[PDB]
Amino acid sequence: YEHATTVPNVPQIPYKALVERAGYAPLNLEITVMSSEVLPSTNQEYITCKFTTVVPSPKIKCCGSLECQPAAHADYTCKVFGGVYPFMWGGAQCFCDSENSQMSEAYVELSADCASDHAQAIKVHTAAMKVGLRIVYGNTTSFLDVYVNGVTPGTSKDLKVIAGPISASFTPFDHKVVIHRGLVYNYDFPEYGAMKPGAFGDIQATSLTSKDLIASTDIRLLKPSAKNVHVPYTQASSGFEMWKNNSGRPLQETAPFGCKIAVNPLRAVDCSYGNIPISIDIPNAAFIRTSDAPLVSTVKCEVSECTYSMATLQYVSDREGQCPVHSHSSTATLQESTVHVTVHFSTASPQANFIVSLCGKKTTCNAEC
Amino acid sequence: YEHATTVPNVPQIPYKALVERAGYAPLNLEITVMSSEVLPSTNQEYITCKFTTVVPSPKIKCCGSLECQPAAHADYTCKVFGGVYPFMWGGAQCFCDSENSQMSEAYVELSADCASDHAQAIKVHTAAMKVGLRIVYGNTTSFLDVYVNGVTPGTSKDLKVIAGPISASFTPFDHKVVIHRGLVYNYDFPEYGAMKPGAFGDIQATSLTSKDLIASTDIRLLKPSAKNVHVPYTQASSGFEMWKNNSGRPLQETAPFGCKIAVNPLRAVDCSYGNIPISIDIPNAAFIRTSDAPLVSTVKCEVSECTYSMATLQYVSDREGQCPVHSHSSTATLQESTVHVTVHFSTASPQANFIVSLCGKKTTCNAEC
Amino acid sequence: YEHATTVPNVPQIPYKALVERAGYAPLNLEITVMSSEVLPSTNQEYITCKFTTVVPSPKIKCCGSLECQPAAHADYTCKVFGGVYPFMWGGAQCFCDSENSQMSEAYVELSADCASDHAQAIKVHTAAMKVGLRIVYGNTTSFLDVYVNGVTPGTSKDLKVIAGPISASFTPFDHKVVIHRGLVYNYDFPEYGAMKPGAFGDIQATSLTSKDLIASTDIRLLKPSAKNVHVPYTQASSGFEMWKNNSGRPLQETAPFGCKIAVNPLRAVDCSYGNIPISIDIPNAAFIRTSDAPLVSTVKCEVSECTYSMATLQYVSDREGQCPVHSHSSTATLQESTVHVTVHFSTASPQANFIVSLCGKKTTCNAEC
């Protein structure tokens, strides 16, 4: 094993803990962080891009009556205009004095160039964590992809390795995150079914290959002038051509604590946070080297080769095999662990004398520086 | 390296500098001066020597008129004399009473013996420098002819060796230097086109095989006496036969600081002056013997054989190879540098204990003386 | 012378000196400066302009070995690349797995457009002087091109006119002057054989029709990518296309004291400086009008016609001929000199009364114013 030691969140840093048991030889505990990956609960709901106005051909007639009927399309604003084309010299070659009408329909479908470049609207929430922690506990060297939580246990080398929930619940992604090419921004997209021509959500869709649209691009039908058969309207300039200016905060460049961001999975890599409380049920079989076998005598220690950031650990014992050696102070960490009589290690300390260890034992050592 | 150490101008003196870097082994820097050569900007302009008067034959006539015409030769002073040879009993067997004239021409061409012995007038100026500095930095022994200036870099052994401009701008040659046989004097020769019979520049020429002369040897035509056809003139005795007395200052014997002088290139050899600031961009590859390989222990030192101007440097290390050893005081310089366990050197000091170283380480040582 | 009077350096200004001899008539001395010309010792050494990279065709092979050999060209950086084109689908249709190499050569020759537009590097030094001084001393009016120095004498009108060295040794050209089209700048060009890609001296040459080059335009060979047979390099943009901005100081516009500058001879014209000490050995024959011939009586003087900047000099003598008349005060200079009984001159003074013267014487015158 029952153990539990605090282990922070900083890659490339070898961690060393110590087992202070009575009887059995104090084991070595080396753990290294390779690369962290934090992926929140991604829930795809909407997508957007450019569009193309699909204005049909008017069905101008004579003294006959007309009233448009709605159906199931994108955008719906139809108005019957009366009084246009008062004569044959007007444009439509009409014979009526003042009883003429038009349908004037106008919708907007997804453009052809939208299939490739797009934007995926999502609502980032309850972020999950998974850190592949290196494991070393003797002669074995296993690397496992472990989920960071106090619910999912391990196995590795007949051991129950638990990641444990970090005390830092800080996510670099807020409530809503939309994708762009291969970047990640913090966007304040409008509510579904409450769109506005204020940009940032024109004719939004469910996915890449959808078939149900909804929108309000401030479209208004205008009464044409008597000259030539035309269909003049005052449309709002697409906001997607203007969003390439007010983009701003890219997040990828404003990475907090050297953190990172992924494209496809929208994950945060190499991001330092808090501490990971690891607990492992190390059995009797792992505590190799009982008090009945190893019996090291007097410990000696002297320093020689040392430069800015072998300690002569000559011992005398019976039969080579294993032999755990670890530091006991607050400074100067060794490089290797299990090295059998004429032991050979190395350190990297300032000038104070140390001890560690190796193992057990222790020592310390030394230184140188 | 970026290094730079001061190195004086005295041949046959081994120079030893020290690299005080953090980490890598402090390298050895041996540099020796072989022979210095200082050649100024030589600009050949004029040459001189003996000459031979070329007096032609007079064209004496009778009662006819005469007036000489100038051309393009050396020296030009012609005067028509009237009243000479008043009768047939005078000399030229003339029939005129008092209407007789002569041309009387006289020029001076370069002698036949001038082709070999000569004198070359030059205007010594902006002196250049070139000193072949010996280079040693390990197992290599290269000798290069390097120009002494902070503009022309080097190569030698993958290193950028710079000579650097000396702080002493003293030249043994002044403004004008003329050659004689195989000697070098400081002469005050007259201005080109302003010659005078005051010697030191009679009928000067451009080079050895020229064809355009200019001069003024104070030549004057005199009216001959009526007796025999002659052409008597009062010429100035050549100054080149008199300059073998007022030569004086030979410079070669009054050599400043044991300096020398050359004949053909007019160069100053073995001439001590100031200091040569050398700077070399020594790369990582040259700094052999990192802190990870050599690990010499306790240093011991004792003196034995020493006479007026081996130090037992027994060491214990792993594997022979290189091993830089250098002095650290102000007196007692070693003879050799890189010598591998039972090291064997030698010194030449008075009686104090020196250093150381070796290397690195250281020491010191010782011484012885 | 034996005379000598100080004469300054300002063109279009008539100079008037006075001979104060005992006995003979005091002569008039008029001297005018036409146009000054100062040409320093021009020593052509280097020239520059645009260039064209001459990258040859690669000699890609198979599993055969390769090592490039240097010769005698401009620029020399060749590197054998290995590991490129691992397959037939790579680019060169190779059959080798990982044993393939290339030569990759690249030099730089003088461009075709360099023949006309160029730049001539020179080292301006010991400036010479030559001023064509007008000469008047009676009935003669000779104009001679005389060198300004106390070494080269004259002749003019049976007189030994000496220019004399000016007390002002100020040259508008400093140590180095390079030509551009038809302008003259003060440039700080690098040392010969110590060129750098810092511009102002890329691939310099001896002259216009040379055949020996030297340079270092920071050229570096890069390992190509496996796709299509190419030779990609990172070259430094020529400094000669950028020097049309940092040109600055043109000198021609910043002419000191209304001075000038020439194109072909690099001369300074109409440039005022100091004083020119002229000395002339005027013989007895030039001092016309002895005390035995002219005998002018009582001098009378009255002023009439005078405007802002004839003085009735009625005399009575025997026989017209010459007659030198000159001013004796510090203001009011005459226009003419030798004018015979009813003399007629003219002046240009303020309001003060003068004598113153014329011559011688015276016165014064016046015034016015």
Q: Which chain A positions have a beta carbon within 8 Å of B22's beta carbon?
A: 308
C-alpha to C-alpha distance for B201 and B190, rounded to whole angstroms: 7
> Contact, A33 vs A312, CB < 8 A?
no
- Answer whether B149 sits within 8 Å of C190, measured CB to CB: no
C-alpha to C-alpha distance for C347 and A358, rounded to whole angstroms: 119
Q: Which chain C positions have a beta carbon within 8 Å of B153's beta carbon?
A: 194
> Contact, C66 vs C296, CB < 8 A?
no
> Contact, A66 vs A80, CB < 8 A?
yes
For residues A164 and A304, state if they share a domain: no
Q: Nearest chain C residue to B162 by CA: give it.
A: C194
Method of determination is cryo-EM
Q: Which amino acid is at C272?
A: S
Tokens, residue A110: 């997804």
C-alpha to C-alpha distance for A354 and B307, rounded to whole angstroms: 49
C-alpha to C-alpha distance for B25 and B19, rounded to whole angstroms: 9
For residues C301 and C269, state if they share a domain: no
By the CB < 8 Å criterion, does B22 face chain A? Answer: yes
Provide Rg for chain C, Cα atoms.
36
**Is B262 exposed, middle or buried (CB count within 10 Å of its CB: 0-12, 13-18, 19+)?**
middle
Pairs of residues, one from chain A and one from chain B, whose beta carbons lie less than 8 Å apart: 9
Pairs of residues, one from chain B and one from chain C, whose beta carbons lie less than 8 Å apart: 24
| CA dihedral (B187, B192, B198, B203) positive or negative | positive
Residue range(s) defining the domain that contains residue A269: 5-40+125-172+255-280
> Contact, C263 vs C251, CB < 8 A?
no
By the CB < 8 Å criterion, does C152 face chain B? Answer: yes
Residue carrying structure tokens 């004008």: B176
C-alpha to C-alpha distance for C37 and C163, rounded to whole angstroms: 14
Q: Nearest chain B residue to C152 by CA: give it.
A: B194
Taking alpha carbons only, the member of A8, A53, A54 closest to residue A32 is A8
Domain assignment present for A20: yes
Of B149, B153, B191, the CB nearest to C151: B191
Of B22, B23, B295, the CB nearest to A305: B295
Q: Which amino acid is at B55?
A: V
Q: Which chain A positions have a beta carbon within 8 Å of B291's beta carbon?
A: 305, 307
Residue carrying structure tokens 């246009």: A84
The end-to-end CA distance of chain B, in Å, is: 40
Domain assignment present for C211: no
- Answer whether B23 sits within 8 Å of A304, measured CB to CB: no
Contacts (Cβ under 8 Å, ≥6 apart) of A113: A49, A50
- Answer whether B297 sits within 8 Å of A304, measured CB to CB: yes
Taking alpha carbons only, the member of B39, B78, B35, B28 closest to residue B55 is B78
Q: Do the two chains C and A touch, given a threshold of 8 Å on CB pairs and at least 3 pairs?
A: no
| CA dihedral (A192, A193, A196, A201) positive or negative | positive
**Is A175 exposed, middle or buried (CB count within 10 Å of its CB: 0-12, 13-18, 19+)?**
exposed
Q: How far is C350 from chain B (nearest CA, A)?
A: 46
Q: Which amino acid is at B60?
A: I
Q: What is the largest CA-CA distance in chain B?
A: 122
DSSP B141-158: EEE--EESSSS----TTT
DSSP C96-162: -SS--EE----EEEEPSTTTTS-EEEE---S---EEEEEEESSS-EEE--EESSSS----TTT--EE
C-alpha to C-alpha distance for A162 and A3, rounded to whole angstroms: 11
How many whole angstroms from its chain centre is CA B1?
35
The C-alpha angle C118, C124, C129, rounded to 5 degrees, equals 120
Taking alpha carbons only, the member of A216, A200, A264, A187 closest to residue A48 is A200
Taking alpha carbons only, the member of B26, B248, B237 closest to residue B137 is B26
Q: How far is B357 from chain A (nearest CA, A)?
A: 16
C-alpha to C-alpha distance for C36 and C133, rounded to whole angstroms: 9
> Contact, A223 vs A263, CB < 8 A?
no
Region of C266 on the Ramachandran plot (φ > 0 left; ψ -120 to 50 alpha; else beta): left
Query: How do strand C15-18 and strand C28-38 relate by DSSP bridges?
Result: antiparallel
For chain A, positions 294-313, list CB contacts with chain B under 8 A. 304-305, 307-308
b/e map B100-118, b = 16+ CB within 10 Å: bbbbbbbbbebeeebeeeb
Taking alpha carbons only, the member of B341, B123, B121 closest to residue B240 is B121
Q: CATH number of the domain that B129 lies in?
A: 2.60.98.10
Taking alpha carbons only, the member of C140, C109, C126, C129 closest to residue C30 is C140
Of C149, C151, C191, the CB nearest to B149: C191
CB atoms inside a 10 Å sphere around CB B264? 7
| CA dihedral (A337, A341, A345, A349) positive or negative | positive
C-alpha to C-alpha distance for A88 and A220, rounded to whole angstroms: 28
Q: How far is B80 from chain C (nearest CA, A)?
A: 19
b/e map B265-302, b = 16+ CB within 10 Å: ebbbebbbbeebbbebebeeebebbeeeebeeeeeeee
The three-class DSSP label of residue A258 is helix
Domain assignment present for A209: no
Integer CA distances (angstroms), C233 to A41, A98, C82, C224, in order? 47, 77, 17, 9
Looking at the DSSP bridge assignments, the partners of residue B221 are B233
Residue carrying structure tokens 């001459």: C54
> Contact, B50 vs B114, CB < 8 A?
yes
DSSP B149-207: SSS----TTT--EE----S----SS-S-EEEETTEEEE--PPPTT---SSSS-SSBBSS
For chain B, positions 92-111, list CB contacts with chain C under 8 A. none
How many whole angstroms from its chain centre is CA B202?
27
Contacts (Cβ under 8 Å, ≥6 apart) of C219: C75, C77, C106, C108, C233, C235, C236
Mutation for testing the B interface, residue in C191, C195, C214, C216 having most B CBs under 10 Å:
C191
By the CB < 8 Å criterion, does A89 face chain B? Answer: no
CB atoms inside a 10 Å sphere around CB B87? 14
The three-class DSSP label of residue C258 is helix
CB atoms inside a 10 Å sphere around CB C284? 8
- Answer whether B23 sits within 8 Å of A308, measured CB to CB: yes
C-alpha to C-alpha distance for B122 and B47, rounded to whole angstroms: 9
CB atoms inside a 10 Å sphere around CB C143? 12
CB atoms inside a 10 Å sphere around CB A78? 14
Taking alpha carbons only, the member of B337, B355, B338, B335 closest to residue B346 is B335
Neighbours of chain A (3+ CB pairs under 8 A): B
Neighbours of chain B (3+ CB pairs under 8 A): A, C
C-alpha to C-alpha distance for B6 and B165, rounded to whole angstroms: 11
Of A304, A305, A307, the CB nearest to B23: A307
Domain assignment present for A155: yes
DSSP C168-207: ----SS-S-EEEETTEEEE--PPPTT---SSSS-SSBBSS
Domain assignment present for B113: no
> Contact, A203 vs A74, CB < 8 A?
yes
CB atoms inside a 10 Å sphere around CB A191? 8
Q: Which chain B positions have a beta carbon within 8 Å of A311's beta carbon?
A: none
Q: How far is B194 from chain C (nearest CA, A)?
A: 5
Of B151, B153, B194, the CB nearest to C152: B194
Q: Which chain A positions have a beta carbon within 8 Å of B297's beta carbon?
A: 304
The three-class DSSP label of residue C344 is coil
Domain assignment present for A338: yes
Number of domains in chain A: 2
Tokens, residue B99: 């209407």
Mutation for testing the A interface, residue in B291, B297, B319 having most A CBs under 10 Å:
B291
Tokens, residue A142: 């296993």
> Contact, C324 vs C306, CB < 8 A?
no
C-alpha to C-alpha distance for B133 and B29, rounded to whole angstroms: 12
C-alpha to C-alpha distance for C120 and B137, rounded to whole angstroms: 42
> Contact, C205 vs C152, CB < 8 A?
no
Q: Nearest chain B residue to C191 by CA: give it.
A: B151
Q: Which chain B positions have a beta carbon within 8 Å of C147's beta carbon?
A: 193
The three-class DSSP label of residue B55 is coil
Q: Which chain B positions have a beta carbon within 8 Å of C194's beta carbon?
A: 149, 151-153
Domain assignment present for C242: no
C-alpha to C-alpha distance for C52 and C113, rounded to whole angstroms: 10
Taking alpha carbons only, the member of B170, B168, B176 closest to residue B249 is B176
Neighbours of chain C (3+ CB pairs under 8 A): B
C-alpha to C-alpha distance for A216 and A194, rounded to whole angstroms: 9
For residues A275 and A313, state if they share a domain: no
Q: Nearest chain B residue to C162 by CA: give it.
A: B194
Tokens, residue A49: 């891009």
Three-class SS of A103-121: CCCCEEEECCCCCCCCEEE
b/e map B303-337, b = 16+ CB within 10 Å: eeeeeeeebebeeeeeeeeebbbeeeeeebebeeb
Of B22, B23, B291, the CB nearest to A305: B291
For residues C324 and C272, state if they share a domain: no
C-alpha to C-alpha distance for B85 and B98, rounded to whole angstroms: 8
Residue carrying structure tokens 């003068």: C354
Integer CA distances (angstroms), A44 to A113, A192, C50, C356, in order? 21, 13, 59, 115
C-alpha to C-alpha distance for A364 and B169, rounded to whole angstroms: 63
C-alpha to C-alpha distance for C71 and A266, rounded to whole angstroms: 57
CB atoms inside a 10 Å sphere around CB B245? 7
How many whole angstroms from its chain centre is CA C318?
53
How many whole angstroms from its chain centre is CA A21?
40
Contacts (Cβ under 8 Å, ≥6 apart) of A188: A176, A200
Q: Which chain B positions have a beta carbon within 8 Å of A304's beta carbon?
A: 295, 297
C-alpha to C-alpha distance for B276 and B164, rounded to whole angstroms: 6
Residue carrying structure tokens 């025999």: B228
Tokens, residue C276: 């020119």
Q: How far is A356 from chain B (nearest CA, A)?
A: 22
For residues A303 and A349, state if they share a domain: yes
DSSP A229-257: ----B-PPPPTTTTTTTS----SSSS-GG
For residues B310 and B334, state if they share a domain: yes
Q: How far is B152 from chain C (nearest CA, A)?
A: 5
C-alpha to C-alpha distance for A104 and C138, rounded to whole angstroms: 111
b/e map B45-54, b = 16+ CB within 10 Å: ebbbbbbeee
Domain assignment present for B89: no
Contacts (Cβ under 8 Å, ≥6 apart) of A352: A331, A332
Q: Nearest chain B residue to A368 by CA: give it.
A: B297
> Contact, A97 vs A62, CB < 8 A?
no
b/e map B185-207, b = 16+ CB within 10 Å: bbbebbeeeebbbebbbbbbbee
Query: Residue C113: phi, psi to the nearest 5?
Result: -85, 5
